[PDB]
Design a protein around this ligand. Structure first.
Ligand SMILES: CC(C)C[C@H](N)C(=O)O
Ligand SMILES: CC(C)C[C@H](N)C(=O)O
Length: 1002
């Protein structure tokens, strides 16, 4: 267990060496004169300071942190800067729940959590409360973040970090410029528009301030008024005097000629209220409150409630329903009503919505429904479905003529009502044909929008907006609002959308689906609700009631990095003396136009011209964004707005558009999800404490590198630190016993197989590092290097040669330094090599002879082969490697070799087999082991290439064992393992065994 500590000491040792050495401060005036290879720029989606950083952030980043700890050891520059989001509410949210959960209850509260994990963080109770105002959140968290990274030891120029609210006056200048530019280009606009909106927040709550439904929007429905005729039912008494209409939502309004009644759920609570113009509306409150914030009531947002009840009390009185050849229809119960979607009412469209015929039919069957709630001689019976839409497989009575053949007679078939409403679903959007007196033959799709708008002008119908599913901001469930005010951003452009689809067809998607989620969300993304009024953030330049919502003031932010060290040099809040000496007051809109837009004129400035070209040079050298990477949940929203924008201010400049991004899955701790709510979670500061960040870094590079859910498992970060500590002591020990390593040359065989393994490994390792799939590059360069170093200490019984033993620890201590820098710098220094290790390069992959490795992956095959047939039955073993080409085996290879060397990469008949393998007196009683093993050539030949046919088989098998048996006495744990030629075999294994399947009997 001291293993964890030993690392933990030298990690902070080599850190306070690195940091006092200032190793990562990549400047662009001193490292641009050196014409080296080309830059490498790695940017992270800067997390909020709404709380200590978590593994889900560390894995979301480790893909880049390693990347640069490698792409530097290939000679490329490495600007890995790091931002710090403070905009957006989510800070104003957890501590506002702190400010009112400390308000109405004692300090701390009494019950029968939100405060309790600000004290389960540990703070002596007093400190915890200064949190409820936002400004102490932002004086305290950007520290804990940067300390946990200094301690993770990440390759990050310090002087380029910051804060993103108005707190930091400098970035604010950067945000203000962006928007004065983005307003100049008629990319912003003002309007009164529908948006997901937090009642209780006072602003349209859209994307990164939600609990449910990151990618969710308004759904539109038509709403119908349903004149309720007297006799009203019992509870409606007092309101004699006003026009009352039941309100429901259908999405096939072409169908409403098919109205035959009106459905509500007898045991749902219903509300009725008066609009602004003064008539009476009965929906649920989710519906009511939704209408309200949509200007539907007198004062925007208020529900003028007049009475309450449940549908029980409603069933009965006739509803006169517009557009239907049944004007005196009634309200009937439908207990299967989705109790959230819609109004709490639905329509009765029996001829194109099967539930309804099920609904109708049951009321017609049992008198245990036929008088159920006020159901007279007329109620359900003479109502029959309405032929309005014919669909050319089945009938005008479509939704019936389908469930009267799939026989959904019972109304309790809700799975089989998943059957039903999927039937007349959308096919009935085109094949369905309107038949009414006025559209006979018209396509239901080209008249959909007309029949609906005919019903608005007739004052019979209006238009309803509802949450597609549900949201929780952090609290009160949200709503489409007719927001009477919102500055918003125009992602609905025709031009800008197309030039940006092209910014995507350029930018590199690390996979084949990520692009599909960028198409499907771009061809989906309309204009955006980008202005908050309460929370935290920066204020709009010209209308300062408005603050900027998070997901938009965080889009071009990457260029501040390029100049941050000089526009701030370390004070995140932006109050220390900015290194170059710019007054935050002296960064006019056009001196950004200068520093960023290349051709844009040198402005009349009261700062001399030195710093002006120097901050632009920084920019001009560092940009573009090479590779950014974050979780797969900022694919539809933030990374997206991050593509539009980077076009929007350089719509001309092709070069600076982000060129490559990367998204992973979420992370799992021990194969299960990571929500504090579970107990399966670790803040970065503790993963480190427990596992020696190098040890952690390990389990992350093994987290999986794919976009599908990448898992992190505690144990393997433990076994991590162990194979690490056995290494260091081995490397310690193998430099003590220098006097133990062979003189002369490195000439023996075991030597050369390890030595070509070694270089086989360095390149294998190289190929996956180039391709940033860190797990598979882990496997190649660490697991495969241990086993092959073990196994060449295994078979060098005359001593491991030192000049192979040393160039091997060089390469590994290197190969591994991107994964685990301090421990490698320790080793590299341990060797008494001079410079810090980050001043090393990519080691030279020497000359490789893979026919040597062929043998290596042949013995690992049999190593893996006989580990198997020992399960049944067990100590000794003699292994017959068959003697030679039998007169029936040589010949197979011989004749097939003949055809092959004459047929251009395609092989003959599968019954040509029979005529050729059959018609051979050489094959008179052994074709039954040439035809079952003429599939030994069409099964395992792609396995290697043109190998098992080219007769001579470039290595003696008998003897690449008889050498391995020491390691193979291990790895099979037997005692002795001899090998006979199948010359002294039982002849059931001489004249049977295929070289490549060596047979073996205990
Ligand atoms: C730039 C931001 C939208 C990033 C996001 N808030 C995160 O925690 O990763
Ligand atoms: C989906 C529902 C709200 C409306 C649909 N026209 C129906 O069959 O009832």
């Amino acid at each position: 267990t001291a293993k964890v500590d030993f690392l933990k000491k030298i990690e902070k040792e080599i850190q306070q060496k690195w940091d006092t050495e200032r190793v990562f401060e990549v400047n662009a005036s001193n490292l641009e004169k050196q014409t080296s290879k080309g830059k490498y720029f790695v940017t992270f989606p800067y997390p909020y300071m709404n709380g200590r950083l978590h593994l889900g952030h560390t894995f979301s980043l480790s893909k880049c942190e390693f990347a640069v700890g490698y792409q530097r050891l290939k000679g490329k520059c490495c600007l890995f800067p790091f931002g710090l989001h403070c905009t957006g509410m989510p800070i104003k949210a957890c501590a506002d729940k702190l400010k009112r959960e400390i308000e109405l209850y004692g300090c701390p509260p009494d019950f029968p959590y939100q405060w309790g994990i600000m004290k389960s963080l540990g703070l002596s109770d007093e400190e915890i409360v200064k949190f409820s105002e936002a400004e102490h959140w932002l004086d305290y968290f950007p520290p804990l973040a940067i300390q946990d990274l200094k301690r993770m030891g990440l390759k990050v120029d310090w002087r380029r970090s910051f804060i993103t609210t108005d707190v930091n006056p400098y970035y604010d200048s950067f945000v203000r410029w962006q928007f004065l530019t983005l307003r100049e280009r008629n990319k912003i606009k003002f309007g009164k528009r529908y948006t997901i909106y937090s009642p209780k927040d006072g602003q349209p709550c859209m994307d990164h301030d939600r609990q449910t439904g990151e990618g969710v929007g308004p759904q539109e429905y038509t709403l119908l008024k349903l004149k309720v005729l007297e006799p009203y039912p019992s509870k409606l008494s007092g309101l004699k005097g006003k026009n009352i209409f039941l309100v429901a939502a259908t999405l096939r309004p072409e169908t409403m000629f098919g109205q035959t009644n009106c459905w509500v759920r007898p045991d749902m609570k219903y509300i009725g209220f008066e609009t602004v113009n003064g008539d009476i509306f009965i929906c649920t409150q989710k519906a009511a409150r939704n209408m309200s914030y949509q200007g539907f009531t007198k004062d925007n947002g208020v529900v003028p409630v007049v009475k309450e009840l449940m549908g029980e009390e409603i069933l009965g009185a006739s509803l006169s329903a517009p557009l239907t050849s049944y004007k005196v229809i009634y309200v009937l119960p439908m207990l299967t009503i989705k109790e959230d979607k819609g109004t709490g009412v639905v329509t009765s469209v029996p001829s194109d919505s099967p539930d309804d015929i099920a609904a109708l039919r049951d009321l017609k069957k049992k008198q245990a429904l036929r008088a159920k709630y006020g159901i007279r001689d007329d109620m359900v019976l003479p109502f029959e479905p309405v032929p309005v839409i014919e669909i050319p497989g089945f009938g005008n009575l479509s939704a019936v003529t389908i469930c009267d053949e799939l026989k959904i007679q019972s109304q309790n078939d809700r799975e089989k009502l998943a059957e039903a409403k999927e039937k007349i679903y959308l096919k009935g959007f085109y094949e369905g044909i309107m038949l009414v007196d006025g559209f006979k033959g018209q396509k239901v799709q080209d008249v959909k929008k007309t029949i609906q708008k005919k019903m608005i002008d007739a004052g019979d119908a209006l238009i309803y907006m509802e949450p597609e599913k549900q949201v929780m901001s952090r609290s009160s469930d949200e709503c489409v609002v007719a927001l009477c005010d919102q500055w918003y951003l125009d992602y609905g452009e025709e031009n800008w959308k197309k030039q940006t689809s092209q910014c995507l067809k350029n930018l590199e998607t690390f996979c084949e689906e990520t692009r599909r989620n960028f198409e499907a969300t771009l061809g989906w993304l309309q204009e955006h609700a980008c202005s908050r009024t309460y929370g935290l953030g920066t204020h709009l330049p010209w209308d300062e009631q408005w603050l900027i919502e998070s997901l938009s003031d965080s889009t071009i932010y990457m260029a501040f990095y390029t100049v941050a060290h000089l526009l701030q040099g370390g004070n995140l809040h932006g109050q220390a003396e900015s290194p170059l000496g710019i007054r935050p007051q002296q960064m006019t809109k056009e001196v950004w136009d200068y520093v960023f837009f290349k051709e844009a004129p040198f402005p009349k400035t009261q700062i001399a011209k030195e710093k002006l070209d120097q901050l632009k040079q920084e920019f001009e050298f560092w940009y573009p964004v090479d590779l950014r990477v974050s979780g797969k949940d900022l694919v539809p929203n933030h990374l997206s707005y991050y593509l539009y924008n980077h076009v929007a201010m350089w719509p001309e400049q092709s070069d600076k558009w982000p060129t490559a991004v990367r998204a992973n899955g979420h992370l799992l701790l021990n194969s299960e999800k990571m929500s504090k709510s579970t107990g399966n979670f670790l803040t970065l500061t503790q993963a480190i404490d427990k596992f020696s960040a190098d040890g952690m870094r390990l389990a992350l590079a093994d987290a999986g590198d794919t976009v599908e859910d990448a898992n992190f498992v505690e144990a393997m970060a433990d076994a991590g630190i162990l194979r690490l500590y056995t290494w260091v002591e081995w490397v310690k020990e193998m430099v003590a016993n220098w006097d133990s390593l062979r003189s002369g040359p490195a000439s023996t065989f075991n030597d050369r197989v390890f030595a070509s393994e070694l270089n086989a490994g360095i390149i294998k390792t190289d190929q996956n590092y180039e391709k940033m799939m860190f797990k598979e590059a882990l496997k190649t360069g660490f697991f495969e290097f241990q086993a092959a170093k073990d196994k060449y200490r295994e078979l060098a019984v005359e001593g491991m040669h030192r000049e192979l033993v040393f160039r091997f620890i060089e390469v590994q201590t290197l190969l591994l330094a991107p994964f685990c820098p301090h421990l490698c710098e320790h080793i590299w220094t341990l060797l008494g090599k001079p410079d810090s290790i980050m001043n090393a390069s990519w080691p030279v992959a020497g000359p490789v002879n893979e026919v040597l490795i062929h043998s290596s992956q042949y013995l690992m095959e049999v190593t893996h082969d006989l580990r198997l047939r020992l399960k049944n039955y067990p100590s000794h073993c003699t292994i017959y490697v068959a003697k030679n080409y039998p007169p029936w085996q040589h010949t197979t290879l011989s004749v097939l070799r003949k055809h092959f060397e004459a047929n251009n990469g395609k092989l003959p008949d599968n019954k040509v087999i029979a005529s050729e393998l059959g018609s051979m007196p050489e094959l008179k009683k052994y074709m039954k082991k040439v035809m079952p093993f003429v599939a030994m050539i069409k099964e395992n030949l792609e396995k290697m290439g043109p190998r098992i046919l080219d007769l001579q088989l470039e290595f003696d098998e008998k003897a690449v064992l008889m050498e391995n048996i020491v390691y193979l006495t291990n790895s099979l744990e037997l005692e002795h393992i001899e090998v006979k030629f199948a010359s002294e075999a039982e002849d059931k294994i001489r004249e049977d065994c295929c070289p490549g399947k060596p047979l073996n009997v205990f």
